[model samples]
Target chain A: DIQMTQSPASLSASVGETVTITCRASGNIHNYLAWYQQKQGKSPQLLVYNAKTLADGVPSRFSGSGSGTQYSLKINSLQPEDFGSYYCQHFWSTPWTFGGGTKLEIKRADAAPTVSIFPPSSEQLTSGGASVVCFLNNFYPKDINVKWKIDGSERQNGVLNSWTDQDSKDSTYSMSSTLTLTKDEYERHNSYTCEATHKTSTSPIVKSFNRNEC
Target chain B: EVQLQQSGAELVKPGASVKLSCTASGFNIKDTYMHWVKQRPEKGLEWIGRIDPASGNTKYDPKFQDKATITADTSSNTAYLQLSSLTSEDTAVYYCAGYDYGNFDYWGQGTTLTVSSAETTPPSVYPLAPGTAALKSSMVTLGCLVKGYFPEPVTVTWNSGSLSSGVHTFPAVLQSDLYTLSSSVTVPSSTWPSQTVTCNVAHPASSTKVDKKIVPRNC
Candidate 1:
């Protein structure tokens, strides 16, 4: 059976705003995928299958349509009722599999986006042994992707310096990378963008930050 | 609306096997999954496995794994369960639990098969003592056990023959693997007993056959 792996683990969305998740197949399954919503006590209700066929009894607002090996599940208008973990399972063959899943939590508009970065902080380095450190505490489970680049050089996997868990009792899934270099090369404004996406849906969120601009 | 009605009780002797069947009615033949579940007399239900009517694919519970085989016939909308190595412990109500994806949702009535005889010790007592225990010097012995189907409405036949002249026993303890099979006795050494004895089991649109030699010898 071709297995499906989901990412982001969880996410949050607001009413009228959409959230999306992706389920990647280990192999080409020709779009034989299905999305199901399983409430705690209810049987998993089929939301979409065969890439995107809304099963009978599915609400009109909860529409699913996709093509080829890629598919997406979109909730046009997020409602409080949609709060829960959304899992995408590929019904491609035997030993059926599911994605890790993205959870959607709806919050009131008056509040600042409750979204927070999974990891507390991270560090990077530029050319000439320049050192750069940054706090990444306010992003979110959604709308943000991470990236790093060396001055005038495409970022590549350098030697991993060290990694540590920030919390003791509870922890979120996160990772960071560090490289050795000089401090002068740490320009406050170098071209770098950390973008995240939920391409399976119509609206994808992208957030970019620059050291000098911030 | 599809309904699956099963047959009633069964009885067999030692070193034997049994089969049970479920007959479906009321809906298109190839639309649902024919699943099987076992509910012991007082134990939680165990999902044995399921048979896909469309492609004839089968999925068995890792627990029942290979102990039994589940098959379906689209033409007749009937499912069959063949249980091998029938022991007294194998005695239980075997039900055809039907579902959309082969996961259990609905079930049929069950048929019980009880195997009993002085010669074969039932599987229920297997843990208490070994089959080697109770050294009876007498060589003439007969034992029987059974497997059953649920949602009663079908029929059961023994050895593919009529059950008019056989003594069938009921399950003393309820088992979940399959319905209990009661045993029928005949002395192998009896006159004119040379014929091969078969405890053939049958139901609506399906049947199972088990053969045993009624060889009775003097100890």
Candidate 2:
């Protein structure tokens, strides 16, 4: 596996400020590299791949470059939404390796929350009581609402905040809510959903899991 | 809407085998190439191989070529990776990713496969021939030799401030089921000194790196 080393464990910047993150592979990785942005609690989102091409829907501000062993990710004219953790990944070798990570924080102002959901595995879908989690990461102002749904029906119980971890460097908070159900409920194959209502979003960002294959 | 859904984790005994699956949707599986990756516990990810669902053609990392079998079922739009002779080291998360322009942009949720007995032996890397070549007229050559590395596909580089005059890679030799390889680079005599001729080697099987440096001086 290729070893990846990233620099500046954390950084502080403001809106309109541009930041750059670098990843050095132990050896030449060709151009098979990618960059990702991972908010405190959300799944990692791809921004650049193949060392240069931008992923679909990724803003033009984010760019990547370099060849062989040296690569970098540059955020041009940083947006308030761009603050988060960034990672560089090398896919050129077996047992891929990722750079440690760069935490991009806004020098000032509150950032919106990035939400993600971790669905139960196929084995869990087949076994007894299963649980799913909804994560809210890198958001300011601790209070946020996470609503759970089963087959579109509102259920208030079995929903609880797992933890709220504070990012001492930026003072932002990351939290998650888990939904638990019985084996029968999982057998029903009903669509499970998590709706996150954050001050930054006009409407709730809803994520759902419906496909059940074991 | 391109999606790749992968199989779940597997808990298997050593010396056994397992076939992992990745089903694709929203795109023509037959036309695109699907690649498999492996991630050991607290370790970096490793590229196993890639298969063309359309043509059934496959290419694997030299190290994995003998250990892995990559296949695809066009009818089901699924790609499969079969790892044989499972061991403790084989226990790790596996991912199926989609390729675009030679880069993996889409990934499936990883599948973790655990083997009971893992290989804990650290890899050994060193320079077999770490020295500079005699200067003839204006040309100077340097050699970087390496051995005791497992798996195929290790990258070798000769860092001479100037562009490499050329590079030569030798055929891999096997010892104790491991691979030993060597490579050399030549540069202009004038550009050889001051800048160290560094031999850098990296591979997926081992986390440690092998580096050898050669300095050029008057003939």
Candidate 3:
């Protein structure tokens, strides 16, 4: 699948302002890109496809354009309801991939990170090794701390990758960390945790996964 | 108001099979195309297959060819997905989506299927034929073939500027567990040498794409 690089990790704009989100693919996608809008707790809504065609029931205020590897989603007049998040996906290849996502806030001066963990495969754990992935999404200023723990002990052997948007309009950043463990360690039924600390949060946000759940 | 209503969550044992259903309302099922999508926890979304309720024409993600069967019931306005030889990887949330232009916009609430224990593997895609030229009424029939792919749901398209507009026939015959399909574009033999025609084959189960360019010749 083609990699979609999205810009404006997070944007602060007025309700009537115009905002454009862009996504650049790693390869030629033949105008097979799509844009989606996601609310706080709802599934994503398809906004555009074939690079430019708007989905049914969507207002004229939203439009998409671009060809080859570059694409953009433009909101002619951003509405209050449009303040949430937007994503770009490619269908040119299989295993359709999505961008890191762009959060649209109502003129916010600061933003906090959204965190989620991808548990290791049960089959992998049963065999002998596995890795847990923690995703830190849409945070501003590019400064944050990510740490991992096994059971109650802090572990230092984790790989973290930080990313920034290529476009200057995007101020926010995102990153991910992968923590590896042995199948023997997982068989012990220990818990793994990922803690993220950012300037916007007075306290670190912690998410844990139980090896026994799988 | 286009709506898709799907079945409830399921908990099944490995090696077993399950058939999930999605019913439609507020739209004519016969005129609409329904596709099935899958999402496993922590995994990306996958398009399994699609069916035109009007004609029972079905297409599957080549990876799901042997693992999944997609069928639609026009009388009941319902679409079905039957997953066989369940594995932990098969444990996921399945959704029936209403097709839009090149994408799926309308979707069902989603049904979760959990396999207690599992094992599985990915799929493989083979090369596609560039095309063959045939003479028929002073026109050239350009035919491209894609075969020997596992799972289901591979898409084939022809491109040659405006010559890309043509009919495509896929899943023409099931070759054992693999799928064999073809696409054709007919143009005046005089125009064949003006441009080169290309055939693109995309399999949702794999990231690799197969493209073949054929320089047409006078038949």
Task: Please report the candidate that would top TM-score against the real structure.
Answer: 3
Alpha-carbon runs more than 4 Å astray in model 3: A1-17, A24-33, A40-43, A84-146, A149-214, B41-44, B54-57, B61-67, B85-88, B102-105, B116-219
Weakest 10 consecutive residues of candidate 3 chain B by summed lDDT? B124-133
**Against the true structure, what is every candidate's RMSD?**
29.0, 29.2, 26.3
Interface root mean square deviation per prediction: 29.0, 27.8, 24.8
Candidate 2 local accuracy as lDDT?
0.66
DockQ of each: 0.01, 0.04, 0.04
Runs in model 2 lying further than 4 Å from the true structure: A1-18, A24-33, A37-45, A67-69, A76-214, B102-104, B116-219
Summarize candidate 3's per-residue lDDT along A1-214 as a digit string, tens digits.
Answer: 4678888777767778998999999898899888888665345678898999998778999989999999999998988788767888777765355676787765534567655555554434554656565556557655689988888788886443334331124445555555656776656756788889998898997777665553
lDDT-best of 1 and 2: 2
State the lDDT of candidate 2 residue by residue for A152-184, as single tens digits.
998787664533334546667655565657677
Query: Candidate 3: lDDT of A72?
Result: 95
Candidate 2's residue-wise lDDT over B140-213, tens digit each? 54544354455555777666324443554443433334444545465567766546667777666666555666
Model 1 misplacement above 4 A: A65-68, A108-214, B1-29, B33-50, B54-56, B59-219
Candidate 3 chain A lowest-lDDT run of ten = A159-168
